[PDB]
Amino acid sequence: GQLTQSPATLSLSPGERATLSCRASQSVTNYLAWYQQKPGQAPRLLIYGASNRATGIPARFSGSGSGTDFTLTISSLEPEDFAVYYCQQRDNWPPDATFGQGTKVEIKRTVAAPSVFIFPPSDEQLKSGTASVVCLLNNFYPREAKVQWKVDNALQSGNSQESVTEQDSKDSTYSLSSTLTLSKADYEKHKVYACEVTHQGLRSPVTKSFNR
């Protein structure tokens, strides 16, 4: 009925031991299964019956547990083990399968503050009738980052969407884009547009702004 995985994210380096776990809501009659999933691909069975390795699964993957607690262990992480892992449960009847909400194994690296950039709406877009303000957070680590939009000091809420890239293959950092959407008439009624960024690599928040 309910499967809960923890932790939500695991930041390790290649060669380290990864330990993830699933807590079943009730006692489980049918020994859990584990799956590995990489971006854009189908899940692939790793562990079935709690301790058995599916066919073609290297020895470094191990599972154990019984009743309500199960653990998936990767004795030593290889570059290809950085992915998302799901645990799964299923009975004879009712037949529905239930899945854990997933644990992401991510690459550990040193702290790196983002360099911030703010882009005004292009005149081109303004003559289309719309206004998009963009705040870029470039090459930072760790993932956690906070973007706060302000228009003439008015906190903006509900009118921005952000997007984040996967860990860069070279430096292992993340990049995030935040777009503030406004009707252009709205955009034209204001002066100061600012994006304040909070991140562990920064000792004080950084704000990039421009005057219309």
Binding site: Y31, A97, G102, S132, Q161
Partner: protein
């Protein structure tokens, strides 16, 4: 050897129907129960339904019963998912999975997945606007549906490029940003197949 191949996904309006197929080879199809498992964007796995090894008994997730019906043809080695009264919440990648040989409560093989997009928006090419260490980029806005490819300087500029995942705006249209940091000319080559839209944008 063992293999599952799906087809049938597509972009559809709400209220319409789609039918998913999953052809199996490499094992005796008639012996195992088969399931459909979906994964909405930015989400985890969410079981959808199953049909017994002999197509006689079916079971559904509550969000789909009365609309979706799962069935099979053991003489064709094909699993189906008839989807009716599709709603926006349904868009996701749908996978077919086989109950395992050693343990039937695990899924040992999965199809590559088939995309189901349900939206009342119609096909539209994007408008590309300029985004002007230093950074610059291109805002590839208001297009439908996915995907769009972005490259810089016909593919000759690659270091420092960050092409962000598309975001679904409240208008039903997608939007994405592609930027590049430079410590020369800069052009984003945007391609949106679904609508034959192509733009080389010099920033």
């Amino acid at each position: 050897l063992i293999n599952l191949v799906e087809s049938g996904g597509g972009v559809v309006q709400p209220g319409r129907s789609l039918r998913l197929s999953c052809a199996a080879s490499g094992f005796t199809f008639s012996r195992y129960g088969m399931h459909w498992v979906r994964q909405a964007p930015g989400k985890g796995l969410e079981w959808v339904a199953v049909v017994s090894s002999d197509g006689r008994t079916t079971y559904y997730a509550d969000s789909v019963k009365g609309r979706f019906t799962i069935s099979r043809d053991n003489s064709k080695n094909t699993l189906y998912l008839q989807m009716n009264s599709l709603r926006a919440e349904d868009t996701a990648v749908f996978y077919c999975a086989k109950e395992g040989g050693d343990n039937k409560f695990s899924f040992d093989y999965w199809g590559q997945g088939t995309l189901v997009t349900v939206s009342s928006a119609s096909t539209k090419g994007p408008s590309v606007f300029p985004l002007a260490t230093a950074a610059l980029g291109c805002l590839v806005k208001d297009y439908f549906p996915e995907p769009v490819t972005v490259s810089w300087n016909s593919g000759a500029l690659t270091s420092g490029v960050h092409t962000f995942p598309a975001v679904l705006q409240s208008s039903g249209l997608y939007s994405l940003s592609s930027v590049v940091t430079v410590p020369q000319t800069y052009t984003c080559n945007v391609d949106h197949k679904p609508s034959n839209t192509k733009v080389d944008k010099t920033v």
